[PDB]
Amino acid sequence: AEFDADVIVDARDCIMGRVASQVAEQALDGETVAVVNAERAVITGREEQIVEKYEKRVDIGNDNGYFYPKRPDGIFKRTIRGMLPHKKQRGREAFESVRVYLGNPYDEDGEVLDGTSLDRLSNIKFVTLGEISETLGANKTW
């Protein structure tokens, strides 16, 4: 489905939380952001502990519910939601004008935001979002 994006962001080799922090700030300023290649987005640290944290969130829940996403599609969306006052009017409008995607559905290349890019030649202790999703049990469709 078509989405009139102002800013198209390439998450490839980029630190998730840092991209998320900027995307939320832009969404509140009225921008229509679209995070692309989220499966290839990165999160620094020891894989084993990162997965433990995300697996605990999948195990947590009850009758009221704690729906935690397994796909990198939704994991990124939830990370952005946590940086937004989503229950307020202004924050919900900001959130609904931000959409994360698997790959790139557009014709344009996404712009790599400043200070978010991770140098692979200087780092080995990190995980890709797709790698977390595969361990969580999500069906690989990318």
């Binding site: 009758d63 599609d73 995607y101 698997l102 790959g103 069906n139 469709t141 990318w142």
Partner: protein, 337 residues
């Protein structure tokens, strides 16, 4: 320190509510091993009878001897595969692409569907082939319906429509096999997919029992001894502890029992035939007389008589196939008596 005991009833068939479709819907299909073919069939439950059979298992001490085996008679007349649906591999899973229909429609099909008058089967076929060239074609399934009119004991003439997967060799060869079945009139029988002795998976919407208490619904105890005479007979002890201050959905409570979909695994097909051979004297109670294409399923089958059941080649068999068992006797004795 108060003895341990497994909880009352399973939590895997939840929520225990009424089924959306009376027509069963398979959630899994067999692998692509052999030659191209339709991965399922459907029929209408008739009733039960026993059969005398010769033991087929080589590991059994009683090999060759006469064994009495219970059997459910299911009337399985030829169905019609009216169309071929194609799925595409989108980043959000499998989504339907297009459908290739026919010209030859069963007279009584307009009781469920809005029958196609103007369709383009060639352009739709091309769309599926471009998707195959692009390498984005998911799986190929056939829209199928039954002919309840061919069954005299079943009151309905309104066809039961369901989708069934085509599995087999390569994606190119099974696309063509699917199109061939459709183009004719879609007419196929139980013989085309199944052979006697094969293990099938039977799915059905169970016998409706309305609202029932925890004892019947979850298999909890009745109040014992002195506790049975105080004003509480078939009600559970407590709805939960003080803390958490809420009732958990895991505690056995009242509600809908029956009319749920169940998929009974590894059902041996004793015999497939056509005639009045499995019929009971005086007719099957609350059904009628069987004189046509049938199947004899070993043991029980979910749902009551007249209900539509579905077949699928076993996705998880334990034993190796022992084809065409020797049926020495079929009981024709009255189910009344």
């Amino acid at each position: 320190p108060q003895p341990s005991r497994p909880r009352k009833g399973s939590l895997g068939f939840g929520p225990r509510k009424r089924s959306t479709s009376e027509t069963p819907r398979f959630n899994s299909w067999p692998s692509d091993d052999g030659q191209p073919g339709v991965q399922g069939f459907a029929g209408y439950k008739a009733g039960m009878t026993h059969v005398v059979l010769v033991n087929d298992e080589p590991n059994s001490p009683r090999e060759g001897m006469e064994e009495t085996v219970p059997v459910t008679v299911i009337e399985t007349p030829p169905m019609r595969a009216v169309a071929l649906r194609a799925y595409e591999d989108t980043p959000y899973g499998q989504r339907p692409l297009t459908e290739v229909w026919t010209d030859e429609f069963h007279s009584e099909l307009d009781r469920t569907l809005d029958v196609p008058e103007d369709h383009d089967p060639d352009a739709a076929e091309e769309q599926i082939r471009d998707a195959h060239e692009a390498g984005d074609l998911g799986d190929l399934r056939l829209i199928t319906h039954t002919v309840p009119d061919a069954v005299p004991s079943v009151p309905k003439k309104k066809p039961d429509v369901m989708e069934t997967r085509v599995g087999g060799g390569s994606v190119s060869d099974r696309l063509d096999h699917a199109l061939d079945i459709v183009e004719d009139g879609g007419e196929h029988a139980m013989n085309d997919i199944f052979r006697a002795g094969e293990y099938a998976d039977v799915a059905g919407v169970t016998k409706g029992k309305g609202t029932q208490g925890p004892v019947k619904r979850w298999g909890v105890q009745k109040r014992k001894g002195k506790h049975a005479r105080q004003g509480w007979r078939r009600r559970i002890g407590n709805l939960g502890p003080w803390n958490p201050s809420r009732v958990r959905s895991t505690v056995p409570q009242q509600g809908q029992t029956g009319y749920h979909q169940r998929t009974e695994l590894n059902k041996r097909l004793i015999d497939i035939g056509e005639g009045d051979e499995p019929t009971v004297d005086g007719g099957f109670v609350n059904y009628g007389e069987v004189d046509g294409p049938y199947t004899l399923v070993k043991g029980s089958v979910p749902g009551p008589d007249k209900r539509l059941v579905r077949f699928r080649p076993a996705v998880r068999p334990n034993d190796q196939p022992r084809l065409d068992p020797e049926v020495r006797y079929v009981s024709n004795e009255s189910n009344q008596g």
